[PDB]
Design an enzyme around this catalytic site. Sequence first.
Site, PDB file in Angstrom:
ATOM      1  N   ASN A  14      22.501  24.986  30.975  1.00 36.73           N
ATOM      2  CA  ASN A  14      21.906  25.910  31.937  1.00 36.73           C
ATOM      3  C   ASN A  14      20.832  25.208  32.769  1.00 36.73           C
ATOM      4  O   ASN A  14      20.132  24.312  32.285  1.00 36.73           O
ATOM      5  CB  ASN A  14      21.313  27.114  31.193  1.00 36.73           C
ATOM      6  N   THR A  15      20.715  25.626  34.032  1.00 38.09           N
ATOM      7  CA  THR A  15      19.877  24.941  35.013  1.00 38.09           C
ATOM      8  C   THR A  15      18.420  24.857  34.570  1.00 38.09           C
ATOM      9  O   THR A  15      17.926  25.686  33.798  1.00 38.09           O
ATOM     10  CB  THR A  15      19.956  25.642  36.371  1.00 38.09           C
ATOM     11  N   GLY A  16      17.737  23.822  35.053  1.00 36.92           N
ATOM     12  CA  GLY A  16      16.305  23.683  34.872  1.00 36.92           C
ATOM     13  C   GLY A  16      15.871  23.186  33.507  1.00 36.92           C
ATOM     14  O   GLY A  16      14.845  22.511  33.385  1.00 36.92           O
ATOM     15  N   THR A  20      20.213  16.992  31.928  1.00 38.54           N
ATOM     16  CA  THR A  20      20.473  15.599  32.264  1.00 38.54           C
ATOM     17  C   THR A  20      19.498  14.651  31.572  1.00 38.54           C
ATOM     18  O   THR A  20      19.916  13.619  31.038  1.00 38.54           O
ATOM     19  CB  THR A  20      20.403  15.399  33.780  1.00 38.54           C
ATOM     20  N   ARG A 549      77.691  47.423  32.007  1.00 39.33           N
ATOM     21  CA  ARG A 549      78.940  48.017  31.557  1.00 39.33           C
ATOM     22  C   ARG A 549      79.802  48.507  32.712  1.00 39.33           C
ATOM     23  O   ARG A 549      80.625  49.410  32.526  1.00 39.33           O
ATOM     24  CB  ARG A 549      78.671  49.140  30.553  1.00 39.33           C
ATOM     25  N   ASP A 586      61.887  40.580  36.109  1.00 36.42           N
ATOM     26  CA  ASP A 586      62.729  41.290  35.153  1.00 36.42           C
ATOM     27  C   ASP A 586      64.150  41.502  35.667  1.00 36.42           C
ATOM     28  O   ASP A 586      64.873  42.351  35.133  1.00 36.42           O
ATOM     29  CB  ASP A 586      62.104  42.643  34.795  1.00 36.42           C
ATOM     30  N   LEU A 593      71.414  49.034  39.346  1.00 36.63           N
ATOM     31  CA  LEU A 593      72.229  50.236  39.294  1.00 36.63           C
ATOM     32  C   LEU A 593      73.176  50.292  40.491  1.00 36.63           C
ATOM     33  O   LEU A 593      72.979  49.617  41.504  1.00 36.63           O
ATOM     34  CB  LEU A 593      71.345  51.480  39.263  1.00 36.63           C
ATOM     35  N   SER A 881     106.625   8.675  81.361  1.00 39.21           N
ATOM     36  CA  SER A 881     105.205   8.989  81.425  1.00 39.21           C
ATOM     37  C   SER A 881     104.899  10.436  81.046  1.00 39.21           C
ATOM     38  O   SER A 881     103.807  10.929  81.354  1.00 39.21           O
ATOM     39  CB  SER A 881     104.664   8.690  82.825  1.00 39.21           C
TER      40      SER A 881
HETATM   41  N1  LIG Z   1       7.489  18.602  32.524  1.00 36.25           N
HETATM   42  C1  LIG Z   1       8.691  18.189  32.055  1.00 36.25           C
HETATM   43  N2  LIG Z   1       9.720  18.059  32.932  1.00 36.25           N
HETATM   44  C2  LIG Z   1      10.941  17.649  32.517  1.00 36.25           C
HETATM   45  C3  LIG Z   1      11.131  17.346  31.092  1.00 36.25           C
HETATM   46  N3  LIG Z   1      12.413  16.968  30.947  1.00 36.25           N
HETATM   47  C4  LIG Z   1      12.995  17.024  32.171  1.00 36.25           C
HETATM   48  N4  LIG Z   1      12.118  17.429  33.107  1.00 36.25           N
HETATM   49  C5  LIG Z   1      12.419  17.600  34.550  1.00 36.25           C
HETATM   50  O1  LIG Z   1      13.696  18.219  34.720  1.00 36.25           O
HETATM   51  C6  LIG Z   1      14.397  17.609  35.805  1.00 36.25           C
HETATM   52  C7  LIG Z   1      15.880  17.505  35.472  1.00 36.25           C
HETATM   53  O2  LIG Z   1      16.537  18.736  35.764  1.00 36.25           O
HETATM   54  P1  LIG Z   1      18.141  18.815  35.664  1.00 36.25           P
HETATM   55  O3  LIG Z   1      18.583  18.655  34.231  1.00 36.25           O
HETATM   56  O4  LIG Z   1      18.781  17.770  36.542  1.00 36.25           O
HETATM   57  O5  LIG Z   1      18.509  20.287  36.190  1.00 36.25           O
HETATM   58  P2  LIG Z   1      20.057  20.691  36.332  1.00 36.25           P
HETATM   59  O6  LIG Z   1      20.708  19.811  37.372  1.00 36.25           O
HETATM   60  O7  LIG Z   1      20.166  22.137  36.747  1.00 36.25           O
HETATM   61  O8  LIG Z   1      20.748  20.490  35.006  1.00 36.25           O
HETATM   62  C8  LIG Z   1      13.775  16.240  36.027  1.00 36.25           C
HETATM   63  O9  LIG Z   1      13.501  16.039  37.417  1.00 36.25           O
HETATM   64  C9  LIG Z   1      12.484  16.241  35.231  1.00 36.25           C
HETATM   65  O10 LIG Z   1      11.366  16.074  36.106  1.00 36.25           O
HETATM   66  C10 LIG Z   1       9.963  17.513  30.197  1.00 36.25           C
HETATM   67  O11 LIG Z   1      10.049  17.275  28.973  1.00 36.25           O
HETATM   68  N5  LIG Z   1       8.812  17.925  30.740  1.00 36.25           N
HETATM   69  C1  LIG Z   2      68.466  52.626  34.237  1.00 36.05           C
HETATM   70  N1  LIG Z   2      68.583  54.065  34.125  1.00 36.05           N
HETATM   71  C2  LIG Z   2      69.299  54.820  35.132  1.00 36.05           C
HETATM   72  N2  LIG Z   2      70.618  54.846  35.148  1.00 36.05           N
HETATM   73  C3  LIG Z   2      71.279  55.534  36.051  1.00 36.05           C
HETATM   74  N3  LIG Z   2      72.734  55.565  36.098  1.00 36.05           N
HETATM   75  C4  LIG Z   2      73.669  55.643  34.987  1.00 36.05           C
HETATM   76  C5  LIG Z   2      74.643  56.608  34.897  1.00 36.05           C
HETATM   77  N4  LIG Z   2      75.324  56.391  33.807  1.00 36.05           N
HETATM   78  C6  LIG Z   2      76.435  57.194  33.336  1.00 36.05           C
HETATM   79  C7  LIG Z   2      77.602  56.274  32.989  1.00 36.05           C
HETATM   80  C8  LIG Z   2      76.014  57.969  32.088  1.00 36.05           C
HETATM   81  C9  LIG Z   2      76.871  58.166  34.431  1.00 36.05           C
HETATM   82  N5  LIG Z   2      77.198  58.889  35.243  1.00 36.05           N
HETATM   83  N6  LIG Z   2      74.847  55.284  33.169  1.00 36.05           N
HETATM   84  C10 LIG Z   2      73.834  54.800  33.888  1.00 36.05           C
HETATM   85  C11 LIG Z   2      73.034  53.560  33.495  1.00 36.05           C
HETATM   86  N7  LIG Z   2      70.629  56.209  36.979  1.00 36.05           N
HETATM   87  C12 LIG Z   2      69.314  56.237  37.032  1.00 36.05           C
HETATM   88  C13 LIG Z   2      68.597  55.526  36.086  1.00 36.05           C
HETATM   89  C14 LIG Z   2      67.079  55.505  36.086  1.00 36.05           C
HETATM   90  F1  LIG Z   2      66.593  56.679  36.576  1.00 36.05           F
HETATM   91  F2  LIG Z   2      66.638  55.316  34.812  1.00 36.05           F
HETATM   92  F3  LIG Z   2      66.653  54.474  36.868  1.00 36.05           F
END
Ligand SMILES: Nc1nc2c(ncn2[C@@H]2O[C@H](COP(=O)(O)OP(=O)(O)O)[C@@H](O)[C@H]2O)c(=O)[nH]1
Ligand SMILES: CNc1nc(Nc2cn(C(C)(C)C#N)nc2C)ncc1C(F)(F)F
Length: 1084
Positions: A14-16, A20, A549, A586, A593, A881
């Site tokens: 996390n920053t600050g 590094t 079918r 799918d 149908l 010809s």
């Molecule tokens: N006062 C103090 N400053 C620190 C210490 N350690 C690191 N720093 C400061 O933190 C800075 C580094 O920040 P940095 O890790 O690069 O921030 P980041 O880039 O967001 O990860 C440096 O410029 C240091 O001056 C510490 O122990 N005391």
């Molecule tokens: C996928 N389901 C559906 N099927 C149909 N048609 C359908 C009719 N028959 C029979 C042979 C019984 C007749 N007549 N069989 C099928 C699969 N329609 C609509 C749907 C729906 F609504 F589910 F998408």
Amino acid sequence: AVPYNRMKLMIVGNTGSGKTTLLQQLMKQSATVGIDVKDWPIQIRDKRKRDLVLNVWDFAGREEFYSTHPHFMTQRALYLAVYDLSKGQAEVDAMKPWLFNIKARASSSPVILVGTHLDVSDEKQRKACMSKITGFPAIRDYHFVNATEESDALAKLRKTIINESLNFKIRDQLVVGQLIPDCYVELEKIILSERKNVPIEFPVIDRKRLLQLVRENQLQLDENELPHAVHFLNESGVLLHFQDPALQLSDLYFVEPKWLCKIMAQILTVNYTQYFKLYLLVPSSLSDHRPVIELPHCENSEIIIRLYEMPYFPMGFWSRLINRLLEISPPNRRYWRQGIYLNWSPEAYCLVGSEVLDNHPESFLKITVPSCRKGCILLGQVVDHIDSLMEEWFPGLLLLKKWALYSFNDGEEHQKILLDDLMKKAEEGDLLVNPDQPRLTIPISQIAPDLILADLPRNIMLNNDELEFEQAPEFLLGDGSFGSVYRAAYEGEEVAVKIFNKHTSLRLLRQELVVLCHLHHPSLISLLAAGIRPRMLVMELASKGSLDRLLQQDKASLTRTLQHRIALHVADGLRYLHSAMIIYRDLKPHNVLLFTLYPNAAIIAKIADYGIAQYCCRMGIKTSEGTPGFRAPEVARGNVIYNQQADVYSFGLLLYDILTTGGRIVEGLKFPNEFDELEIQGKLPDPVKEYGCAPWPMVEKLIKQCLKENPQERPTSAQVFDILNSAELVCLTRRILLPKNVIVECMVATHHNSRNASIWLGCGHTDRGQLSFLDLNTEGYTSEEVADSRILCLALVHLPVEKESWIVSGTQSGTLLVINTEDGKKRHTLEKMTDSVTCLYCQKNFLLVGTADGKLAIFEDKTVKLKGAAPLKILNIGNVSTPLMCLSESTNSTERNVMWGGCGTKIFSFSNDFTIQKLIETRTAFSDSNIITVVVDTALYIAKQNSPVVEVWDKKTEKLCGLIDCVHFLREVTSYSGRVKTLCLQKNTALWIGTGGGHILLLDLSTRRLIRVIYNFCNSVRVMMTAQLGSLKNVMLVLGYNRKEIQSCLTVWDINLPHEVQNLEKHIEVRKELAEKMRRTSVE
Ligand SMILES: Nc1nc2c(ncn2[C@@H]2O[C@H](COP(=O)(O)OP(=O)(O)O)[C@@H](O)[C@H]2O)c(=O)[nH]1
Ligand SMILES: CNc1nc(Nc2cn(C(C)(C)C#N)nc2C)ncc1C(F)(F)F
């Protein structure tokens, strides 16, 4: 088998807090923009412990980099965490969402944690909370130490990684002691060496380069094992192969991970880099204040309010939310970092955006619409979108708990009741009651209209007093794993009710309704009503039953047009679907149908059962669903993220099911292992070989062109709908190929139906004349050179006398050869004419052979059994010809006694009297040429070589009528090869012009009106005729050239092509007035 000890130690700080400087004072800035990957080795005390080199990644904390980071937190990595102690438990609270992000993104990764700044560390303050910390990840230590003076227990990372060989194992394997073969380290070394020469401002390479160098270095890297090797090398942390097909980065390979990371600054400093998938996508620049925006309707009753209670905002949540919710086609936007404000008018505005003034550490999302109806549609759309988003990319959140804020008495604070109980309270009965005063009551249509399905149009509203179906299992149809579609009536109709199962989350019903109730089309089944009391759906009952079918059972009704209707209307449905960012995943042949089995109808297929149709923008999908056998390749390996081209593969599989006429599905309904052996690729046969079907060789060309692995080589749904909308694809029957170094310029079929096709192919490429003999149904090319000179013309006569048949040939040397069609050895050569041979042609049966000298050469049909004879007198009706190569027959009333033709550059005719009843010279520019063929339907359409025009002379007035130019007709297809090397005539429909440029020209008959033009399949058209095939008529051979390697295809065209190019064009014209009439109602 060398132990390759390398693993990332990304110190996610996390920053600050000094993320590094800690590692700076461990190994040996101001604000480390983006990731900064240093390098760091280890030489442990026990020298036998090999070098534990660690690609440290030094992340950053500024929220823009918070958003851009979470794609580089992979596995095989021993994380850290840093947090100041001067701020006490506050920094622990601030790092809590970060630790949650850690345990969400990476699960098999230990997470040490360390403090910093022991000079001002008031550890007694936050020690209790830090102990109470240990959903979180597996915290394994706590070593709060100084920052610059490293005197505490350090270098413990070594003692916690080298000893974590099996204590940190990628599925029980070896991480730091992985005995990896020499090939992998060879690839690693060669890439680490080639990192230099590649450019430094954009270091990228092509996989072809990698293959070429691995071959140049003899790396022994097999193409089938190369992607696994590069994937392991990627997961090691030396290069980044983004193999995600939703990003199109499958080809370009990267060699510098250091470069990819430090581009955020380059892109926020304000080609071909334009794919910043990590309108505009620069979420760094977004401001992060609460803007000065006030709601118009500011009260406690006039506006709905939703809520979302979330533990931790996932890294890269708000970016995806804004990138999804900038779809604005359902608008003065004022989107800051988190809260978009989609204003339209003082009547409808969705103000998404967080709120943390909840007197609690939790994080609250909220939605707000003014409680008119349009606001309810807005809210019931944004809830669907947010739930799709949170269900695809960020599954870990569902922890999540809804909240609906209602108000009993206006002008007061709002209570909080959650939807897991409001669902029951609104499913039992409407009019949610007030416990304090029962006289007070509020409607469930202005509190949460995503629970009574009131966020849909008023027309689709159930009329349960006219739904007279009994749940009795007599009426049963398909069971698509969520419901069970009965058979029912609705106010008088045939409707297929779909009652859902015992317990199904309403998210499913809305997943289906958000696609069934918005986009209408005459290829997608149309909803009639959808209630909520039993949670049912009502859909238009497809009469003729599902496709499966009808394949297994009714193989007789399945013609060779219906197989192109139930494969064109489905492509129409897919085109419309993918044109509105929905993906289907799918499309299997149990889910297409039918409505009518009469071929030339208008609505023959309609997809159904939209159970798993999710929204899919350019970002893509990450889940993996479908069904074994009909799934896309990359769906199986669920890790990769795919997009709208993992559906066209399902269409290719449906097409292979249709072309086989249900052989794959029935032979695979036994063992799903067989149906899943090709779930990726590489186990599909060639259809015609086994299942016994008939060829269809402009589908087989497509069926492999939309079946490849590479998700960019497949067509786009538009491109796979604009290949089927062409009558050039329904009307072939075959396409054969002939060997190399052989031509063909002479053809004779066999209508006597010996094998129903025993096509000969006279050729004269060599000095000697060859005589091929091709069989159709078996493709046997048994050539035989039996001549001395070229074989110009062939001819066949099936003698009725004694039921004989004796093919006859002709030679450039001027010889009349004769071969028995049944007796393979009978060279009854006849009396050679006084000159060369030009053409031959067959009651009064007689070979009307044509010579070069311009003399009619006639024989006797009964004189075949002789050996050398000049049966009837020669008719020298021309000069030296005048090349007499024209012969033809008559069609008008079949009066063969009106046999036409033309001697050289002149026209003549005669009868059985063999006297010239008319002789009309064609001296009327191109007149310096000769004549090829004449045809008589109502006049004489006469061709001629090297001519872009074909003349029209009449058999009654003997004068020119019209000049049907060819190059003029071809002037809009792309100094042209607009010649006419052949000219065949149909019976009574239209002309068939064959142009040497490689174009069939289906000229019609009325005056000159073109019907289509065929192209892009051959390079020329040598000779065209018309034959029979398999006891049935209607085929039209065409001999295409390829010219330099000569290849002479032998196509086969159905002769019903004109009424096809008309019928299918009228069909497509019909259903595209419906595709706009139905759709225009959805906007209204
Ligand atoms: N006062 C103090 N400053 C620190 C210490 N350690 C690191 N720093 C400061 O933190 C800075 C580094 O920040 P940095 O890790 O690069 O921030 P980041 O880039 O967001 O990860 C440096 O410029 C240091 O001056 C510490 O122990 N005391
Ligand atoms: C996928 N389901 C559906 N099927 C149909 N048609 C359908 C009719 N028959 C029979 C042979 C019984 C007749 N007549 N069989 C099928 C699969 N329609 C609509 C749907 C729906 F609504 F589910 F998408």
